[PDB]
Amino acid sequence: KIRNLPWVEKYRPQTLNDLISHQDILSTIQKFINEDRLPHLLLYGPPGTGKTSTILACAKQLYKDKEFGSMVLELNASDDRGIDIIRGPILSFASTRTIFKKGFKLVILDEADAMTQDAQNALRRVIEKFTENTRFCLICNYLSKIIPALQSRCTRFRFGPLTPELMVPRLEHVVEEEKVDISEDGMKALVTLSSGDMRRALNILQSTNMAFGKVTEETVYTCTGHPLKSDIANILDWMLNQDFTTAYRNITELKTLKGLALHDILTEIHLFVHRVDFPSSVRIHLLTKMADIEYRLSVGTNEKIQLSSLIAAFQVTRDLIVAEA
Amino acid sequence: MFEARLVQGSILKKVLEALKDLINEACWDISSSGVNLQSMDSSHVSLVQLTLRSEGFDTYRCDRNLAMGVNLTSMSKILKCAGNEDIITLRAEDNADTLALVFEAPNQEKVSDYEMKLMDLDVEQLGIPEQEYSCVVKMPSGEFARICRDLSHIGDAVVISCAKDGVKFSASGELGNGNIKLSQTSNVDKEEEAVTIEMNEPVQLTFALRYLNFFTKATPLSSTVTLSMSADVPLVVEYKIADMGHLKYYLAPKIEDEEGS
Amino acid sequence: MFEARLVQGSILKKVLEALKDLINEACWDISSSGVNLQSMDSSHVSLVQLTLRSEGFDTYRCDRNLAMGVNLTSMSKILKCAGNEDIITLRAEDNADTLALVFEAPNQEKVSDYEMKLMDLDVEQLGIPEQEYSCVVKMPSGEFARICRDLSHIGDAVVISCAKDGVKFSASGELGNGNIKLSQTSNVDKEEEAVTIEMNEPVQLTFALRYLNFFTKATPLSSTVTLSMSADVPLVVEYKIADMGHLKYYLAPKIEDEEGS
Amino acid sequence: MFEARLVQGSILKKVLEALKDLINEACWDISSSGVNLQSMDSSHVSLVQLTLRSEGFDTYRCDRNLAMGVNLTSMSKILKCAGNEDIITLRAEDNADTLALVFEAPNQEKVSDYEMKLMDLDVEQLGIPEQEYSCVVKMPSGEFARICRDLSHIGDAVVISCAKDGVKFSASGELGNGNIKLSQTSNVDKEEEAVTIEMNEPVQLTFALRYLNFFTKATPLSSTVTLSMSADVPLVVEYKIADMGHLKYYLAPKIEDE
Amino acid sequence: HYELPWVEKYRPVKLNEIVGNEDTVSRLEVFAREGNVPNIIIAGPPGTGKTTSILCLARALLGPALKDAMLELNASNDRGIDVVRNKIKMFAQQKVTLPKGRHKIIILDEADSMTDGAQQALRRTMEIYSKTTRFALACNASDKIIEPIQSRCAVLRYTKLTDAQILTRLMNVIEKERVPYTDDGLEAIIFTAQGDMRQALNNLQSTFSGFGFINSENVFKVCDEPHPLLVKEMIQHCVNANIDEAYKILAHLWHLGYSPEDIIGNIFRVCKTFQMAEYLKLEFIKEIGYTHMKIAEGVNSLLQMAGLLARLCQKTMAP
Amino acid sequence: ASSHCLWVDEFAPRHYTELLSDDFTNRCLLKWLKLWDLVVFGHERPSSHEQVLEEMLEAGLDPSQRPKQKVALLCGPPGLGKTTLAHVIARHAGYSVVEMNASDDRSPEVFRTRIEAATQMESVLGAGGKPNCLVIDEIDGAPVAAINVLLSILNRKGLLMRPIICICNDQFAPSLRQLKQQAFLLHFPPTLPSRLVQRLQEVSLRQGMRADPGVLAALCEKTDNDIRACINTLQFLYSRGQRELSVRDVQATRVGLKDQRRGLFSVWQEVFQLPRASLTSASQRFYRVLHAAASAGEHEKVVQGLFDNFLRLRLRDSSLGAVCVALDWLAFDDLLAGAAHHSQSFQLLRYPPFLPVAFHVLFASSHTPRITFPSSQQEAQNRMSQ
DNA sequence: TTTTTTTTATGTACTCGTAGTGTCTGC
DNA sequence: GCAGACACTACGAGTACATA
Ligand SMILES: Nc1ncnc2c1ncn2[C@@H]1O[C@H](COP(=O)(O)OP(=O)(O)OP(O)(O)=S)[C@@H](O)[C@H]1O
Ligand SMILES: Nc1ncnc2c1ncn2[C@@H]1O[C@H](COP(=O)(O)OP(=O)(O)OP(O)(O)=S)[C@@H](O)[C@H]1O
Ligand SMILES: Nc1ncnc2c1ncn2[C@@H]1O[C@H](COP(=O)(O)OP(=O)(O)OP(O)(O)=S)[C@@H](O)[C@H]1O
Ligand SMILES: [Mg+2]
Ligand SMILES: [Mg+2]
Ligand SMILES: [Mg+2]
């Protein structure tokens, strides 16, 4: 049947084989499940890489639908996870048996970086004393916000960013399930603008399919509003090759016609700077000035003056690069 | 269209008062047989099975089956201002989100229409095994409320044992131990106060006192309680309402470990 | 010089906490007919009238029309020091800025005297129009305090509808709509529960919950309460308190939504 | 092996309520003659000397001498669940860390076995408190607890003055002055209400009101109470029980006389 | 029955099975053999064996009387102000018959979580009932335990386990489990352990379950290289104003999925104990804090970290 | 029972002659407790900071034949013998020690009941009974209302007739401000290393253990003149496997090292003055100053002391560049505090511990500076509120 | 050889005092 | 049958701190 769902939730890897990237980690967790030797897991990485979906597929593989409510205790940041919850419901779930069928239980603590340090210190002996009865899975995006005791007690798997070569078949599966007309440059634009994020890949795909009806490079870069790489090359050429007035006029006309934002222009110019064989002092000056301009855009500032400063940071270094020779 | 009419208002108060700090939200399953409720607690340790029969209500009609998950703290505030000698009507439509509660005042002069917004939790059905038990004990509910209250003063976990002789309550605490052994109290004038042993195999298990004390707040529902115990299946605290249905309380045993020495 | 003497200590111990969180000051106006008090809330919503006639006092002396202003932050803490069934008197000199009240200490052995400074505030009498309201109804005192408490668990604003059948209290919130309909309670033994309707024109106005809860804190002073509603005149909560006078409340209605077709 | 079957649980409930907040421990010295409890306060204000004889129990077995240091808040939790008319079995082993109490309190054949962990304490030894009291009077237990409750409503300390006529109870404070004039009440039908006089050298001392209210918590434990006091020697009240034994309470006077 | 993981399955049950800190563990062996152990506080890094040493010492001292003469309290318990007054003091007053040289042991594991008032109430019960009871404390941050408690105990400090000390226990686990291995795979396990026996056992079990063999490629396919081991040379390149190699290390750490907060935390951790000039270190730390305020304010991109690296390179060239 | 007791309990002093504290403090406490013999025992005959204490012992008595200072307040670092001195001096003067410590309830009702039981009554034993001397340990952790109850029973004119001894570890607690103006303040100096070394030598000779004076002096300077910590360290280090203690076992950081709570003035001296002459490396002083300023606590008071004391030094930087970069560091700390308290991101508080080491690097001198307590910012805030 | 005080905006955790209230005792 | 006393839990209030 059809459901009114976002494509990040309509297409979720309910089984472990539907995930794409981390094949060694998923194979090791599958061999943990098959041997019934599942340890305390610590899944960390950037968002959108498949940490929640992995443990949900593992929980559905370990437990049946008639025993899932008494075997899995899933708590996240939307629930209260204070120290009275660690001493209360979590300890009573860990220290007791099951109801229907005998087996080890699972405590899923999603977004474990948001927990307080008192709760994390109270979690240590609950994990250690009841290893035979229950298992604890900790999910976080920041490993520095989890205490080193819980990092020692749980074996850590890094769910790194998804490579664009592996995000193509899952996007093709979503495309062929949703009847989406997409070209090759549309797929390249999706996997370039995602930057190791499967969630925003499906979000950009759904928004581009609804906005235009076809997914090409121009439709993706128009719906997202991201500048094209030819536009960034033209901006760099104007900033490095002519005077202040003509570069200001050309960059202002390009930003007015294309409807560009200075944040993405700064990001792509920062990526272009390290590719250009600059002198070291010129590179340091450009990085400091671009970081200052990027910091200035986080408040109620005028974007035209910051665009002029972005032009100025290269108009200063024109003479230094040329006189370096 | 679902329309259930409580003949008495005290039973709905006494059911909800037992489940107030235990059941997170009420899952009323409605069919032609009656009203069912199988919901776990917040800690996923206890399970509450409530079955209200259709013949217990004053008027009961049900066209299509419904599963109306609703909040219980919201249901607690509308049941405090409810009389104990008046009829309460449960109403809900086919494709609506309002659960209507119509009753009378303690002054018995005004209608009181209390709507509740239904919840959309997707809860999987828990499979009750319905197997036999190695111990079945009939017991007064007033005595079982007293003993679990008396052993909460000593410790926090009770090692309740049963055998052919009777049920035994033990609580090893900080002060010491409290051992209660009651057996064969059927030689009295009343009929509710009696200890009857049905099954054979002895079983010793340890349970939390916090959940057992929550189970004993259903004491005004039934004057006699039934305790079921076995070595694998959990402890069942079966209340049977006189003309309305029955209530079952499940509690998992705690993990205990022997000393290596 | 002003000198008045009450007949009971509970006629001031139960009315001051209703004005404790409602109004910030108690302005007493002294006249030959009696003592008047018309104070308005700082939010320009609530307005309380309290007049006690001179015949109900044990004794009353008034030669000049004097007005004194005192704060609720200091008279409330000395009210709990005073007794319940003791006698209370109030004394005020013509030229001094001190209000002295003499009563009995709660051990019933010694005279306890407290002094309060007179706050000089330049206020003016607003003046009630005393127009004929579109609704006149009679409700019990203790039952009406239980009405606004029940709608306090639902939403922050109540809806009052007074047609010819009775008075409907409604509150649509994030939990669900709570509707009651008090009507036709003339067949009771006690005369204070006689619910009756004295007008014909219906009206529907929404009011703030918090001040209506403040209005129900003066409920044990009288046996009944009189409610008056109109199209644009504020709601009147009238108490006929004991024998020495009557108490009157005013509450501005809430805004209405742009529900035009 | 130690066993002591108390014939009624009223004996034990009223003792441990009379010294619940008075002393923090119970030191039951066990001998063949009976059960002895001699405990003093840490601040040296009150002394409790309880003596229960072996003839007042249902059974009494004692192989070796025992000292059972017991917490009073731990054993006050037992009697709360004990019956007023019930046989209580207080038993312990010779060298054991635990003390057991067995009873059938609710009269519904509910065999209750309550055990407590003993506490080891330093042995503070006082041999015999001297008894050369000049003023010894007799008084009913109910009226003595009546005037201690009456005097507690006004002041915080009482002045007790023995005399040929009787004992005088007075207090002073900001509220008022509560004073009684005890006369000879021997012309009554009840033999417990009579005030017997066997005194000489009338004295006057000041005592704390809080510790006297704790001493008068044993009013139903005995019919009458014998008050013994003198100069530079603490006041003794005496609750002579019917068959189990006797119970006395010592109270040091305040430093500020009158 | 469910088999335990190798962290809990191969927990030592005797004090002679504990590797690392040989002098302190040997003295604990002597104290367990003879008796009359003083109050101890064992401090150190996680996974060193403090709780294992305390529990093995309690098991060797008590033995069959471990159930009645030991009180183990964790951070999962209450242990508030009213637990020290009414449960710890009552257990210290409790009469337990023990052999000569043996006392009751009150184990207060993870004593960092205990409040200041509870530790103040813990002092006199430590001092009065010391003839019959003893205290065994374990902690990570020993400064959270107050000075009067540390004066009342023999403060033991555990250091990080070396490569050979972890390697001996790993060889014992391998010979118990018949795990095939190579030398460089065990060196990779040691390198990923970083002085932690728990992480060594977890990585060994993960590599054995996922691949069935221990070489360097199977270890590094599931486990990871430690973070500050490359941040150290990133800071070294920032000292010599080499912005290109520092950005290469920064981009390599960025493409592995590390958040900017973790990267700047490792940068501050390296710069806190780096071997350079003191004034240069202070202005480096001030620049790190200035960038960390921007990261916590909401702006956190690769351009901000590159600007931080460029500012750290400038601070060298601006004496 | 040599194998049943701790070595601190076995070698604890039971007489006056074997105390290890400073003799001046013991004599002052004994003379203060012997001034109560007029009103307690009913006998006429009992048988700088020093000048004020000698004046307090000879200033006479009040008209109610009692000393004008009815509380002896004992303050100092832990492990010196304050509780030992109080108990030995109370048992020496014929009193019975009534102990009130931090494991009691410490609520004002229980505090009032305990003091009224300990001080307002006689003894049960009558003639020959020991008087009760109330010793209140850990009075620094008591609540302010308990101190108000103690002062109310101190100055009630229900008259006090028995001495009260109060023992604290920090005299500058906010709850003991009004207690200091009324009590007989006895500040405990650190113990003499020669006497402590002789006592440790006697303890080791009693246990059959051999140790040089040098290794015992190393232990004494390691434990910061703590008697209890030194005896516990010897009890752990000796055991029975070996007899001769080595220098390297004490010099090792594995046994005997405890985290000291450094005072504010010691931290300010350590920051503003270089150590006197290995330890001459700048990185060792950097880490020592950082760890000491972290271990002190009360970081805002340290920052206020640095702000109020760095301009009164004999500064060699006449170009005011060091002052400018120190004020930049202070503004950096202020911005870090504001950003951590604004965005709920408290991982920005690991940097302001480097403010005292920045002040140590900038203003290191070999002179002897006079450090005063910071008061300018608090007086400015009080005047601004007024 | 030198010590007083309240500001940062939430969120959590701890601790302590207070007030309706269910239940027991008694005339 | 109704007034007084006992402890019970929920709730209001004050305070500290949050890094390595
Ligand atoms: N490896 C993956 N394979 C396939 N789809 C994926 C993968 N990772 C993410 N997705 C998609 O993205 C959605 C969200 O994935 P999540 O598991 O929630 O990512 P996540 O790792 O949990 O990120 P955070 O840290 O929780 S915000 C899924 O429902 C899928 O549609
Ligand atoms: N020194 C050691 N020798 C042998 N195994 C060890 C050692 N240290 C740790 N282990 C193993 O790691 C497990 C955990 O050790 P623990 O002692 O619980 O850690 P810990 O020292 O308490 O550190 P924290 O601060 O509590 S996380 C043990 O069960 C052993 O399997
Ligand atoms: N002369 C002595 N010889 C040997 N041990 C001693 C001597 N004097 C004291 N001690 C011991 O050293 C310790 C002194 O600490 P205490 O007096 O009990 O407390 P304190 O010194 O006031 O320090 P705090 O603040 O309470 S931790 C005790 O364990 C004494 O038994
Ligand atoms: Mg997630
Ligand atoms: Mg541990
Ligand atoms: Mg001490």
Side-chain angles (χ1 to χ4, degrees), chain A residues 37 87 128 144 152 158, chain E residues 3 77 196 198 224 262:
Chain A
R37 311 190 216 277
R87 297 196 187 103
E128 258 190 342
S144 58
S152 300
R158 191 191 96 266
Chain E
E3 193 187 22
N77 297 92
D196 205 318
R198 259 203 214 91
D224 254 8
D262 297 4

Side-chain angles (χ1 to χ4, degrees), chain A residues 6-66:
Chain A
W7 292 2
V8 300
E9 299 297 320
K10 178 185 290 297
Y11 298 102
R12 179 175 283 271
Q14 307 285 126
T15 61
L16 289 175
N17 287 329
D18 303 1
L19 300 129
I20 37 175
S21 182
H22 328 87
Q23 290 303 123
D24 299 322
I25 297 179
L26 286 167
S27 302
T28 307
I29 296 173
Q30 184 61 256
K31 290 178 179 180
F32 278 141
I33 291 178
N34 294 333
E35 295 167 6
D36 293 322
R37 311 190 216 277
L38 180 67
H40 302 290
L41 298 185
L42 176 49
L43 269 57
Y44 68 102
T49 54
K51 302 181 297 299
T52 309
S53 305
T54 293
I55 197 59
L56 284 185
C58 291
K60 285 193 293 297
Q61 184 179 346
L62 283 168
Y63 311 108
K64 308 166 186 176
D65 55 334
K66 300 177 182 179

Side-chain angles (χ1 to χ4, degrees), chain A residues 124-125 128 149 153, chain E residues 11 46-47 49-52 72 74 109-110 138-140 198:
Chain A
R124 297 161 59 170
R125 294 300 294 173
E128 258 190 342
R153 277 167 173 83
Chain E
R11 176 178 289 264
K50 309 161 289 188
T51 312
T52 306
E72 219 271 324
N74 305 313
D109 197 9
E110 309 153 357
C139 64
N140 286 308
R198 259 203 214 91

Side-chain angles (χ1 to χ4, degrees), chain E residues 145-152, chain F residues 78 223 226 258-261:
Chain E
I145 300 184
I146 65 177
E147 172 59 41
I149 294 299
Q150 294 191 238
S151 181
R152 281 167 174 83
Chain F
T223 58
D226 198 287
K258 56 189 182 70
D259 302 322
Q260 317 279 354
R261 219 84 182 108

